[PDB]
Amino acid sequence: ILGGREAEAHARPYMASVQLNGAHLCGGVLVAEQWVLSAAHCLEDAADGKVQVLLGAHSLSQPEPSKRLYDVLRAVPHPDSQPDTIDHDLLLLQLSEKATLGPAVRPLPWQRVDRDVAPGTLCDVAGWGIVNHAGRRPDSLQHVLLPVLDRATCNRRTHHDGAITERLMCAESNRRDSCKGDSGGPLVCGGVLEGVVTSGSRVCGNRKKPGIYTRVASYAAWIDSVLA
Numbered sequence: 001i002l003g004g005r006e007a008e009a010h011a012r013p014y015m016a017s018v019q020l021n022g023a024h025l026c027g028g029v030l031v032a033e034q035w036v037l038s039a040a041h042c043l044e045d046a047a048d049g050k051v052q053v054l055l056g057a058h059s060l061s062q063p064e065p066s067k068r069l070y071d072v073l074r075a076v077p078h079p080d081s082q083p084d085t086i087d088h089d090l091l092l093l094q095l096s097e098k099a100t101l102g103p104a105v106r107p108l109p110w111q112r113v114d115r116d117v118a119p120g121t122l123c124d125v126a127g128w129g130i131v132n133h134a135g136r137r138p139d140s141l142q143h144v145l146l147p148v149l150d151r152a153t154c155n156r157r158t159h160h161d162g163a164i165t166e167r168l169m170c171a172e173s174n175r176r177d178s179c180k181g182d183s184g185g186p187l188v189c190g191g192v193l194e195g196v197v198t199s200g201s202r203v204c205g206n207r208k209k210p211g212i213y214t215r216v217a218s219y220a221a222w223i224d225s226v227l228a
């Protein structure tokens with residue numbers, strides 16, 4: 001997160017750190033007792049490495065009673081996702097067993113009504129991604145409140161030039177933004193999961209390149225099929 005602050009420890013119990021060989025790689029969101037939603041581009045070129053999900057965490061390195069690293073039984077990228085596109089950038093990870101729930105580990109209700117979030121709605125995005133242009137990684141969870149950018153402004157030639165489909169949403173990227181290591185994390189609006197961070201457009205903190213988030217309501221049938 002660029003231009004954010006340190007999050008209140010365990011105040012976002014749905015927050016997951018998706019790891020590869022013991023290192024934070026991507027953000028994630030606990031959507032059911034045994035399922036973590038993330039971005040498909042995260043699993044890209046990971047084929048061989050060990051993927052785990054860390055739940056109940058604030059600090060990536062320090063011991064916390066609620067912290068628990070889970071192994072992954074199944075990694076389910078969206079069938080229509082592809083390395084060279086920003087579309088269908090979703091991944092579902094099935095934990096080895098149901099997560100032990102509590103005040104610091106809880107799934108987040110997610111949006112099932114396929115209608116746009118109002119322009120300007122303030123949404124929360126959290127992550128352990130880079131915090132400056134040099135690439136400094138925070139040990140603890142960061143967050144920023146970002147206003148939703150209307151799709152038409154986002155689709156301007158000066159911005160993402162028609163790449164924002166009805167299945168994608170934007171949020172302002174002026175100084176405050178999600179960045180590398182924040183992909184797969186949640187965009188939460190009015191206490192409900194609305195979007196998943198995509199690294200589709202890679203630049204961070206440039207207002208002419210808004211943040212792109214995959215709309216979970218647009219993939220409601222896919223999420224339900226995988227969990228079934």
Ligand SMILES: NCc1cccc(NC(=O)c2cccc3[nH]c(C(N)=O)cc23)c1
Nearest residue numbers: 177178179180183198199201202203211
């Ligand atoms: N709000 C904009 C936003 C949100 C989330 C992530 C990103 N930017 C990246 O993730 C990124 C950046 C640079 C090199 C990179 N290399 C790779 C890689 N090999 O996976 C990713 C990146 C941008």
